[PDB]
A paper describes a structure:
Here, selenomethionine derivatization and mercury soaking have been investigated for SFX experiments using the high-energy XFEL at the SPring-8 Angstrom Compact Free-Electron Laser (SACLA), Hyogo, Japan. Three successful cases are reported of single-wavelength anomalous diffraction (SAD) phasing using X-rays of less than 1 Å wavelength with reasonable numbers of diffraction patterns (13 000, 60 000 and 11 000). We succeeded in experimental phasing using SeMet-derivatization and Hg-soaking techniques at wavelengths of 0.954 and 0.984 Å, respectively. Such high-energy X-rays, which are essential for Se-SAD, allowed us to collect data at high resolution (1.4–1.6 Å) and perform SAD phasing with 11 000–60 000 indexed patterns.
SeMet-labeled ACG (Agrocybe cylindracea galectin) crystals belong to the space group P65 and have two monomers in the asymmetric unit. Each polypeptide consists of 178 residues and contains two Met residues; however, the first set of residues, including one Met residue, is disordered and the Bijvoet ratio is ∼2.2% at 13.0 keV. As the lattice symmetry (6/mmm) is higher than the Laue symmetry (6/m), there was a need to resolve the indexing ambiguity. The lower Bijvoet ratio and indexing ambiguity complicate the structure determination. Prior to merging using partialator, the twofold indexing ambiguity (hkl and ) was resolved using ambigator in the CrystFEL suite. We tested various numbers of patterns in the SAD phasing in the same way. At least 60 000 patterns (a mean multiplicity of 443.4 at 1.5 Å resolution) were required for SAD phase determination. The localization of Se sites required 35 000 patterns. The electron-density map from 60 000 patterns was readily interpretable. In the anomalous difference Fourier map, two Se sites with peak heights of 24.6σ and 24.1σ were identified. The number of patterns required for the ACG-Se case was much larger than others.
Numbering used by the authors:
A (entry chain B): 2 to 39, 46 to 141, 145 to 161
B (entry chain A): 2 to 161
The structure:
């Protein structure tokens, strides 16, 4: 078994195409060197045809994290919400880590050490690009590390 | 499937006991916020990162030796001789692109440990001792380290 590590720098308002796609069994971690909780910010996993397989939106004024999916050029699907943004980052200390495990029929999302949701997929497929949309809750550049070739 | 993420801060000359053990299919990554490749006075001493079993066996010992200009990979049972070394020459070449920081990732593939420095696979190490990793340690020979004085370790477990 030969696995791979790839590292990407993603600016706010930018996208990257992955050198190795993320599929069942694989992991993506996003690292932020800041945490500004004092504004809506999103991290996205996208398929090769531009579907949003997983959209994670942090909304500080509404005080929720929204999880959703959508096909390209079509309406958003059914939202899942987790309340109280700040309580999901307890113990952070000015930095943060967001990890997504692809478990096949679900995505597991972990903020630092805490599992926040087991999201049942509304669209299936392989992740081939990542994007970061925002004055952000995270640093202007976030680093993404993928671990692929695991299964 | 419920996987887990755990984060540890390891000072030079210290060790941690893991809350979730690392076994086949799992990952450990070490992060350093410095990389000291200097040659003269202030050059680093030999520095190692270790994966240990519950009885203190060294399942994987990774020794960075700047003056000898090798990375040594080995194992050993508690209080016994070291087993057969595997060596990779030219330390600085394994960190090209780093820019003052470094990531070291170990995948446990069951029969082998795969070791990756940043994005580059440096060895597929055939295990000489098998078992579960239950603690990590960081040794700089009580002197100057090649890495930052605190190294962060992240484990990903419950994968398979
Ligand atoms: C209670 C309820 O059902 N509210 C619904 C809103 O939550 C919903 O808002 C949209 O939600 C999407 C996830 O389900 C997604 O977060 C939308 O924003 C993203 O996508 C936009 C394109 O559609 C655009 O690219 C945004 O920039 C991006 N957001 C980020 C942070 O990347 C979100 O729609 C946006 O935000 C809301 C808050 C509102 O201002 C919209 O005008 C804006 O487009 C809407 C569905 O549109 O339905 C319910 O109201
Ligand atoms: C060419 C050849 O075969 N050289 C061999 C040396 O490489 C070997 O040195 C030991 O190698 C070990 C891995 O195979 C390991 O790195 C030893 O150092 C670690 O373990 C020590 C206890 O045995 C002690 O705890 C050290 O602090 C620790 N080092 C680190 C950085 O964690 C290493 O032995 C040490 O270093 C060598 C270079 C020498 O000074 C030894 O006196 C010293 O203990 C030796 C012994 O197996 O055999 C060949 O010479």
């Amino acid at each position: 078994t030969t696995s791979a590590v790839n590292i990407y720098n993603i600016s706010a308002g930018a996208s990257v195409d992955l050198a190795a796609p993320v599929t069942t069994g694989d992991i993506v971690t996003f690292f932020s060197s800041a945490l500004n909780l004092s504004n809506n910010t999103a991290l996205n996993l996208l398929s090769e045809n531009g579907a949003y397989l997983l959209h994670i939106a942090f909304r500080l004024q509404e005080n929720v994290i929204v999880f959703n999916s959508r096909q390209p050029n079509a309406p958003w699907l059914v939202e899942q919400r987790v309340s109280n943004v700040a309580n999901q980052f307890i113990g952070s200390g000015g930095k943060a880590m967001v990890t997504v495990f692809d478990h096949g029929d679900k995505y597991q999302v972990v903020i630092n050490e805490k599992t926040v949701i087991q999201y049942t997929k509304q669209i299936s497929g392989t992740t081939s690009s990542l994007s970061y949309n925002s004055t952000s809750i995270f640093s202007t550049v976030v680093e993404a590390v993928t671990y692929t070739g695991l299964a």
